[PDB]
Design a protein around this ligand. Structure first.
Ligand SMILES: [Zn+2]
Ligand SMILES: [Zn+2]
Ligand SMILES: [Zn+2]
Ligand SMILES: [Zn+2]
Ligand SMILES: [Zn+2]
Ligand SMILES: [Zn+2]
Length: 162
């Protein structure tokens, strides 16, 4: 197997889930509004976090090839996955449903080139292939570091068709 471009691939984007990202925003507010307290080991979405959705156009015969994450302005972003068992409509996201490691990308003031934590990013990347089989859709929580926003990001995953 001599790697190259001739191989067939599938790029699947991480679309911003505004409805779901909003649902979690209320939740945090509701609890302040009602001076109420959150469940045990519950994950409350933060202002710097937004929920993203990844739709697996294919589930079988997948091999993680590489992440395709680009920031158009100097900053940092963390892509953390959620359990393929987490039912966003039925239950509140629990801290234990956040996957590890998270894939972290960044760009600096003098570079137009992205750098990241290769190891962890690959670990995470590898898992995605087997997660595609649990269910057709998957969600992630993307934490935008200071200076960046959803407008500045283009995230996707490239898989090799087997
Ligand atoms: Zn949605
Ligand atoms: Zn408690
Ligand atoms: Zn490649
Ligand atoms: Zn390759
Ligand atoms: Zn690890
Ligand atoms: Zn690590």
């Amino acid at each position: 197997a001599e790697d190259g471009p001739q191989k067939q691939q599938l790029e699947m984007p991480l679309v911003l889930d505004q409805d779901l990202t909003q649902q979690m925003r209320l939740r945090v507010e509701s609890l302040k509004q009602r001076g109420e307290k959150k469940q045990d080991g519950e994950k409350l979405i933060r202002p710097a976090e937004s929920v993203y959705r990844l739709d697996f156009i294919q589930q079988q015969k997948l091999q993680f090839d590489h992440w395709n994450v680009v920031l158009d302005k100097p900053g940092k972003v963390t892509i953390t996955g959620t359990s393929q068992n987490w039912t966003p409509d039925l239950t509140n996201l629990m801290t234990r449903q956040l996957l590890d490691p998270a894939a972290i990308f960044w760009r600096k003031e003098d570079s137009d080139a992205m750098d990241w934590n290769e190891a962890d990013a690959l670990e995470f990347g590898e898992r995605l292939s087997d997660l595609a089989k649990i269910r057709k859709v998957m969600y992630f929580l993307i934490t935008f570091g200071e200076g960046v926003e959803p407008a500045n990001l283009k995230a996707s995953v490239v898989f090799n068709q087997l």
